[PDB]
Amino acid sequence: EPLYSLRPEHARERLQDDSVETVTSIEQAKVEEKIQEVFSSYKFNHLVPRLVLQREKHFHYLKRGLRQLTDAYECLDASRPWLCYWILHSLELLDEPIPQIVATDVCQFLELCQSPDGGFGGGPGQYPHLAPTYAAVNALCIIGTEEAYNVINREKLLQYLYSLKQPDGSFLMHVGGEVDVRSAYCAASVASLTNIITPDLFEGTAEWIARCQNWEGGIGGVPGMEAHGGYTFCGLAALVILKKERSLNLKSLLQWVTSRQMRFEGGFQGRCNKLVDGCYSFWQAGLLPLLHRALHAQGDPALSMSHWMFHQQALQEYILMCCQCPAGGLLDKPGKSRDFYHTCYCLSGLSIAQHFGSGAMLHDVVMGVPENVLQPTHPVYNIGPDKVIQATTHFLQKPVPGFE
Amino acid sequence: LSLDSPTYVLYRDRAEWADIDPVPQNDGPSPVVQIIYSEKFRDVYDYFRAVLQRDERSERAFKLTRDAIELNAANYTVWHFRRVLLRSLQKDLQEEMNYITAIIEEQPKNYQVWHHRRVLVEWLKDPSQELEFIADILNQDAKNYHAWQHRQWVIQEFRLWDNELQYVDQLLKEDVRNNSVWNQRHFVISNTTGYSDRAVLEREVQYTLEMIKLVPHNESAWNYLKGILQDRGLSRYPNLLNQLLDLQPSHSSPYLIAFLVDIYEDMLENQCDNKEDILNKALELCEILAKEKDTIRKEYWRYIGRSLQSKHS
Numbered sequence: 001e002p003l004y005s006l007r008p009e010h011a012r013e014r015l016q017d018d019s020v021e022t023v024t025s026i027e028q029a030k031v032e033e034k035i036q037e038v039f040s041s042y043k044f045n046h047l048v049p050r051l052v053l054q055r056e057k058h059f060h061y062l063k064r065g066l067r068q069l070t071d072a073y074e075c076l077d078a079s080r081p082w083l084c085y086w087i088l089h090s091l092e093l094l095d096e097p098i099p100q101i102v103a104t105d106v107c108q109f110l111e112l113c114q115s116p117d118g119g120f121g122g123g124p125g126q127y128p129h130l131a132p133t134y135a136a137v138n139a140l141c142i143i144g145t146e147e148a149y150n151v152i153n154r155e156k157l158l159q160y161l162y163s164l165k166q167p168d169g170s171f172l173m174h175v176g177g178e179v180d181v182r183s184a185y186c187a188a189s190v191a192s193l194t195n196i197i198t199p200d201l202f203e204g205t206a207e208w209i210a211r212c213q214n215w216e217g218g219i220g221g222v223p224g225m226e227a228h229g230g231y232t233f234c235g236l237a238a239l240v241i242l243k244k245e246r247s248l249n250l251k252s253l254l255q256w257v258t259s260r261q262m263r264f265e266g267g268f269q270g271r272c273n274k275l276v277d278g279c280y281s282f283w284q285a286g287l288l289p290l291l292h293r294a295l296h297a298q299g300d301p302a303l304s305m306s307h308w309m310f311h312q313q314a315l316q317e318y319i320l321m322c323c324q325c326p327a328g329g330l331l332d333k334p335g336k337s338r339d340f341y342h343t344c345y346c347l348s349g350l351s352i353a354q355h356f357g358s359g360a361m362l363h364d365v366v367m368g369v370p371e372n373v374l375q376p377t378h379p380v381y382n383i384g385p386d387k388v389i390q391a392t393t394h395f396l397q398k399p400v401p402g403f404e
Numbered sequence: 405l406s407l408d409s410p411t412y413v414l415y416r417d418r419a420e421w422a423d424i425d426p427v428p429q430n431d432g433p434s435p436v437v438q439i440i441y442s443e444k445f446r447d448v449y450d451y452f453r454a455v456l457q458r459d460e461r462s463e464r465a466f467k468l469t470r471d472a473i474e475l476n477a478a479n480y481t482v483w484h485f486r487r488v489l490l491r492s493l494q495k496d497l498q499e500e501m502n503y504i505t506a507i508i509e510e511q512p513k514n515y516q517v518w519h520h521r522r523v524l525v526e527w528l529k530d531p532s533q534e535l536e537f538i539a540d541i542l543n544q545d546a547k548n549y550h551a552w553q554h555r556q557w558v559i560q561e562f563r564l565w566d567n568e569l570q571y572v573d574q575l576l577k578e579d580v581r582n583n584s585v586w587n588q589r590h591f592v593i594s595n596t597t598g599y600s601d602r603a604v605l606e607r608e609v610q611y612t613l614e615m616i617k618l619v620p621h622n623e624s625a626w627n628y629l630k631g632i633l634q635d636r637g638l639s640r641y642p643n644l645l646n647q648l649l650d651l652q653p654s655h656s657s658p659y660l661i662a663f664l665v666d667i668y669e670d671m672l673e674n675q676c677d678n679k680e681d682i683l684n685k686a687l688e689l690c691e692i693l694a695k696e697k698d699t700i701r702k703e704y705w706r707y708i709g710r711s712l713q714s715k716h717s
């Protein structure tokens with residue numbers, strides 16, 4: 001009875017298709033049948049459920065990937081700073097230390113990815129792009145040594161961000177590339193951490209992000225687009241950095257994200273009427289601490305003093321029972337293959353689901369064995385809160401760069 | 405020579421490439437996140453690195469970028485150099501449209517392929533194949549985010565609004581739960597007639613209510629009904645409350661109950677009649693949702709309940 005997903009009443013949360021079958025209801029029922037087999041597995045084998053996070057299996061998978069990968073990862077040859085970030089962040093969540101020699105090796109590799117004109121590319125000699133730039137800066141802040149902070153050419157990073165800024169407030173992902181809400185988040189994230197925000201760098205940016213909020217309450221990649229969890233995370237986190245959260249309708253956004261949690265599975269979907277997916281445990285659940293902070297800043301007296309506005313217990317049960325690969329690493333849903341992307345965001349979402357904090361109030365919910373407790377993650381940057389303070393404190397001792 | 409042809413040969417074994425030296429990748433002396441590339445991938449990328457370092461704007465380099473793209477379609481550096489070669493060599497861009505059509509069919513969720521197609525369409529100033537091509541991708545995955553983004557881009561850029569509401573109607577018949585299509589409906593109406601026209605709004609609310617009657621547990625229709633009325637305020641429409649309470653006995657759902665709380669919220673914020681009665685009905689529905697009908701959102705409904713007490717008492 002302690003596990004919410006296993007109670008008899010939980011059977012009533014299965015899909016009601018109203019006797020009208022479409023591709024959406026058929027695929028949703030297929031997933032719910034597979035998820036119910038996972039929930040009922042303890043009853044069928046006659047064992048007490050024991051939700052254990054397979055730390056040592058995840059750790060072996062991560063420390064190996066940090067050094068070397070098979071030709072199966074050739075599709076990630078232009079995302080190698082992302083592999084640095086996903087792996088180092090999962091290791092920090094699992095409280096696994098980075099040896100000084102390994103930390104130095106990552107600093108030197110990210111130096112090879114850095115462009116002479118600012119920003120980082122997906123690998124040595126590749127043109128700079130805001131996505132691997134965001135990942136490389138977050139990876140260097142997780143290391144947090146003087147060597148790591150010194151890798152970043154702050155003068156050229158600022159010049160690079162200006163070369164992507166558009167008159168309407170948006171940013172290109174790269175030169176001769178395209179605009180979307182992720183680029184504003186990538187720029188605001190790296191510029192705030194490294195202390196390179198000039199008075200006009202983000203002029204119009206908050207107003208452009210606000211145009212991406214649609215009729216559903218969530219945010220799309222560009223104006224007109226369907227609300228999507230990943231882009232909504234990027235949109236709200238960028239506005240929290242710029243202190244312009246009130247540019248959005250926060251109540252229609254709160255109602256939209258809370259609706260993305262699946263009543264049966266416990267996990268989150270990325271868009272309305274789509275399937276559950278482990279990575280949205282971070283993109284969607286990560287929005288509730290950001291919304292709690294935004295509403296708290298307005299003096300909202302109805303906020304909880306112990307929990308986020310999502311079912312923390314049910315999200316942890318979905319991740320622990322349906323997203324762990326037995327050989328290590330985490331995944332989208334049962335039947336899917338493991339990868340470092342889902343290992344990063346399943347564990348980040350699990351950490352948000354365990355740790356609540358607002359003002360002088362702290363309250364943890366650790367489902368399963370007590371050893372399942374992860375290290376906290378900052379809801380804006382998705383790196384440890386300690387690493388955010390250490391990086392911001394380091395770079396605030398340097399002036400904001402001038403123009404050449 | 406196709407990359408998957410049974411007679412594909414490595415570039416190091418090709419006579420027409422014997423003059424250039426392959427340039428290996430520099431991963432450092434103590435490498436991290438190192439991909440143990442297959443011989444085929446490593447061979448193409450060592451020769452791509454050679455033509456890029458010397459900026460060789462030749463036909464052989466153009467054919468080489470096709471192989472580099474097929475090995476990793478997310479390598480945006482290769483895509484940039486391919487576009488440099490398309491313009492320097494004066495390549496027939498309609499032949500390039502045929503190529504991008506084939507690779508998007510193979511990798512429809514890759515970002516770089518869709519961006520390349522938009523550049524080709526902008527360069528040729530020709531959107532005549534786009535709606536049909538996108539409808540073929542949506543026929544395979546009706547919720548592909550890149551396909552819907554490309555469709556919106558083509559419609560806005562070239563003013564191709566005339567037949568989109570009809571296409572939206574077709575896909576809603578196929579799957580009334582496809583939220584991407586309910587979004588496209590709002591995209592078309594808000595950019596053509598708008599929702600301020602009373603006849604349009606009436607037609608949209610009557611259509612949405614008929615879809616709700618047919619499939620009461622489809623959330624997209626409920627979200628669309630709320631989205632088109634929330635602008636001016638749900639309390640601005642007094643018949644809406646009683647028309648949903650009439651559908652409550654036979655077509656009930658936590659979506660209907662949540663919509664009733666949304667209506668009561670706006671009635672209280674706009675000085676409604678029987679204010680004490682309206683707040684109690686709203687708090688009672690918040691309790692039923694938190695404890696029974698929608699327990700996954702218990703913290704949201706408890707927040708709404710406390711929020712209403714704080715504001716209206």
Ligand SMILES: Cc1nn(C)c(C)c1C(=O)N1CCN(Cc2nc3ccccc3n2CC(C)(C)C)CC1
Nearest residue numbers: 075076078079082131134182186230231234341478
């Ligand atoms: C995996 C994978 N497999 N392949 C073949 C590739 C190329 C990759 C890869 O490199 N990825 C996956 C897609 N994301 C897109 C993206 N950029 C972001 C920048 C900042 C924050 C979030 C960002 N998000 C995620 C979403 C917001 C879209 C949810 C970049 C990293």
Ligand SMILES: [Mg+2]
Nearest residue numbers: 177480516519
């Ligand atoms: Mg690109």
Ligand SMILES: [Zn+2]
Nearest residue numbers: 277278279332
């Ligand atoms: Zn995922």
